[PDB]
Every structure is written in C-alpha cells, then in structure tokens.
C-alpha cells in the first residue's frame, strides 16, 4: 500500500502491494486521477531517479513503506501524422497526443467519407482503441497509421 505525491500539493495512496505493474500503477494513477499514462513522470522520493522498465518494482523501491513523486507533462503541442487508407493513400493530419483515437477517427472519417465505426486503426501492427489517447501509442511526427475496413461476417 504505497503513496504518491503531486504539486497540488496533495497526495493519495496506491491501494496495492499487488498486481504491481508500473503501468498498472500508472493505470491506478490513470483511473484514480484521470491522467493518461503517457504524460505521467514518476520519480522515487526524493532521489529524483525516474525508474527502469522491466517488472514491479525494486530495483529501488518496494513495499507500503516508501513513496514516489508524480508530475504530469501537460504538453499537447500539435504534430503532423499520416493515415494511410484502404487503397494505400496517406493523407496528413494535424493532431495532439491528447486527442483520443476516436477523435482522430472523426478526422479520418471526415476526409475519407466513411462512417467512423465502419473501420478501425492500427499502428505498427497494433490496434488503436477508441477511448485511449494518441499519446498512448508513441505517435511521432509523421508516424503512419493504417486504416482497416470493418468487415461484416
């Protein structure tokens, strides 16, 4: 049963020495404070070292008897990406990592003339989920997103 500090400056505890995923921590943070994982900056209190990626958790922090700091990167500066369609046509879009996949789909549905729920998107082999933000998928300037028709069978 940990705890995380912010700049509110208020705190709250992660109710879990369990599951343990940094990401679930993130998600725990995500659903506890409505903040997207990709904007979360974690650092062990007070050694500002900001963590490995592997498995929960220490390394350098474990048990109900420690604390970690959380700062939210509030950057959603616009960027240009590509969406390549059913026939292989890529068109540029202005986006923010903060917009949802669903929002980008509205754009694409706009420029392609296909109902937003009549197709779905992938990035580098992986499916993009509607409710999640573009930033979840490590989208970069000029990343290419693929449009797949929603078949009916």
């Amino acid at each position: 049963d940990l705890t995380v500090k912010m700049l509110a400056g208020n705190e709250f505890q992660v109710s879990l020495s369990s599951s343990m995923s940094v990401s679930e921590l993130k998600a725990q943070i995500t659903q506890k404070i409505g903040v997207h994982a990709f904007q979360q900056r974690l650092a062990v209190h007070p050694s500002g070292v900001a963590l490995q990626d592997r498995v929960p958790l220490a390394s350098q922090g474990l048990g109900p008897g420690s604390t970690v700091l959380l700062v939210v990167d509030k950057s959603d500066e616009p960027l240009s990406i590509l969406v390549r369609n059913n026939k292989g046509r890529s068109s540029t879009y202005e986006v923010r990592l903060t917009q949802t996949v669903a929002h980008l789909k509205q754009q694409v549905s706009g420029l392609e003339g296909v109902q937003d729920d009549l197709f779905w998107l992938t990035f580098e082999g992986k499916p993009l989920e509607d409710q999640l933000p573009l930033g979840e998928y490590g989208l970069k300037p000029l990343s290419t997103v693929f449009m797949n028709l929603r078949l009916r069978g």
Partner: protein, 259 residues
C-alpha cells in the same frame, strides 16, 4: 462513491452505456449454444454470430493468456468451465457489437487481446534506423510480442519495413529477435491455397467467405491429423486442400534471431 469505485475496479474505465449494453447482450445471447465438434467447442450459428465463433475458437488456442480486467477474466474462466454466456456478451460489449449484426472477427479479436496479458515470457527486438538519425533497438515484451496486424506470413513479419522518420527522411525497422509461445498474424482477407500434403507452418486460421464489400461468412480452421478441420459455426467438416481468403493466421512458438 463506493458503488462507482467497485464497478470501475470490476469493468475498468468504460463509457456510460457499457453496463446497459452488457446486461442486454447477456439476456439476448442467453439461448446461444457451444456445441462439441471433434472434441472441441464451437459456437452454434445464430443471429449472425459466426464472427464470434472465429474469435472464440481462436482465443481458445492461445495458451497462457489472462485478462487484466477482472470481470473479463472471470467470464473467461466461466467460459473455460463450460458456461460461455457472460464471456460472449462481455466481448460483444467491449467490442461495441450489436446483437444479430454481422461484424469483423479480426477487429474484435485484437480489441479483446488488447485487454489481455501473457502469463509467460515473450520478446520482440526491432532494429530501427535512419541514414540521418542513426540506429536504435526497440524491445517489446509480453502479449504485444505475440500479435501483429498488417501481415499474414512470418517472412513478411521479418522483412524490412519502410516508413517516414521524424526528421522527414525515410526510416527502416526490422525484426532481429523473436521469442514467443505462439504468434497471431492478422490481415485483410487474402486468397491462399492451403494444402496439407506437407504440414503448413501455421496451426490454425480464420477465413472470410464472400465479397468483402457485402456481408460475408466466417469459418475457423485448424490443422490437425494431417487434415484441415473447418469449424463452421457449430459444425465441422474435413478437407485436404482449400483455396480460401485467410484473415487471422495462428503460428506456433517463435524462436528466431538475426545476426
């Protein structure tokens, strides 16, 4: 409040309609049956559910998966215990599927797997490079190392892929290491001639029948006993060779490196 917190723990972050849709699907699919064919369970055809037969029979082949959403894992458990109604309604609900409406098995399959994790090891290593920006290796672990949407053969998976780099120049990435317990590749319906004189490298696949611009039909195929088994929504037949439009292809454990 407490009640809202518990639903959040149970179903995770969902939209305001989710629980109503789930509970209605639960009631609506109550009559569906899972029937035993060649000693495995297949979803009996009903209300255009063939795409769910494909999805369900494919998931049943995926060893060591587990769902990170508790209601979904419980439903999954119940399904394995022979009571599939909850799991079916839940995946329809997470899939935004509508009862009696035809849908896309691959889109659903990978939507469902996005909520899952792998209870064993798996790893991809990709090499990316730009003439300007240089070289970086990208490591990927768990369930995500086991699925790919966009190609349907292992050689296409291992081929150099070209895209545009951050810097404006062209960028390349390519798989240089791969260890998995299985490998699911998915793509658009694609005509292949599948023969069993020589055992194919894959162990199962799904097939879309019909024109893709109209409402088609899904069949789930398994390679077994030197034959192709075709599970068509509750029934099964057997063939040696089959010219068909493949969608999802399931391969065995990968164990690959590139010098």
């Amino acid at each position: 409040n407490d009640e809202t917190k518990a639903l959040k723990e149970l179903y995770g972050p969902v939209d305001p309609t989710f629980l109503h849709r789930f509970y209605s699907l639960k009631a609506a699919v109550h009559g569906w049956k899972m029937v035993v064919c060649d000693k495995v369970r297949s979803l009996k055809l009903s209300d255009n559910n063939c795409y769910l037969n494909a999805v369900i029979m494919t998931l049943d082949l995926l060893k060591d998966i587990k769902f990170v959403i508790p209601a979904l894992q419980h439903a999954f458990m119940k399904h394995k215990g022979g009571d599939s109604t909850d799991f079916i309604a839940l995946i329809m609900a997470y899939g935004n599927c509508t009862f009696g409406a035809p849908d896309d098995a691959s889109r659903l399959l990978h939507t469902v797997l996005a909520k899952a994790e792998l209870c064993c090891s798996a790893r991809m290593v990709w090499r990316e490079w730009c003439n300007v920006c240089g070289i970086k290796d990208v490591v990927l672990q768990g369930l995500k190392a086991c699925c790919y949407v966009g190609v349907q053969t292992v050689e296409d998976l291992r081929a150099r892929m070209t895209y545009v780099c951050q810097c404006g120049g062209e960028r390349h990435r390519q798989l240089v290491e791969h260890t998995t317990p299985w490998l699911l590749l998915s793509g658009t319906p694609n005509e292949k001639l599948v023969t069993t004189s020589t055992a194919p490298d894959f162990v199962a696949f799904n097939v879309f029948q019909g024109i893709e611009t109209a409402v088609g039909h899904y069949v789930h195929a398994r390679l077994k006993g030197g034959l192709i088994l075709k599970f068509d929504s509750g029934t099964v037949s057997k063939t040696s060779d089959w010219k068909c439009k493949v969608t999802d292809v399931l391969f065995p454990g990968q164990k690959y490196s590139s010098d």
